[PDB]
Amino acid sequence: EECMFKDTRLDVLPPQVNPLNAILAQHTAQTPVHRSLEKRLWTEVRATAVSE
């Protein structure tokens, strides 16, 4: 009843959770493993492309 006569903003703060983790986890769960290993090839070939 005395909510107006308090300062409870510290008792209720916005969480520091990154929602991106929930997104990337759903991304890996849907993909297979050989595509995960392929991404290491896509990155490596991109490095050699920038090198040449």
């Binding site: 009843e1 005395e2 107006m4 006569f5």
Partner: protein
């Protein structure tokens, strides 16, 4: 007889009341703070006695003359 909301003055949340202003550096001016400016008559009491006497006397004079 009555619910607690009516007694405490609120259904769910007690709302803050704006406090009363004071006007620092001067006397409060309210219906009950007027004796600071207007005391009972004390300056012309003896003149009141004199004027009451003279009013009674002059009224009696002219009334008696009219009646007679």
């Amino acid at each position: 007889p009555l619910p607690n909301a009516v007694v405490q003055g609120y259904t769910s949340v007690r709302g803050p009341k704006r406090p009363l202003d004071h006007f620092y550096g001067r006397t409060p001016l309210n219906i009950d703070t007027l004796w600071h400016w207007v005391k009972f008559p004390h300056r012309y009491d003896n003149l009141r006695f004199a004027v009451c006497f003279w009013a009674f006397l002059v009224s009696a004079h002219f009334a008696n003359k009219k009646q007679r």
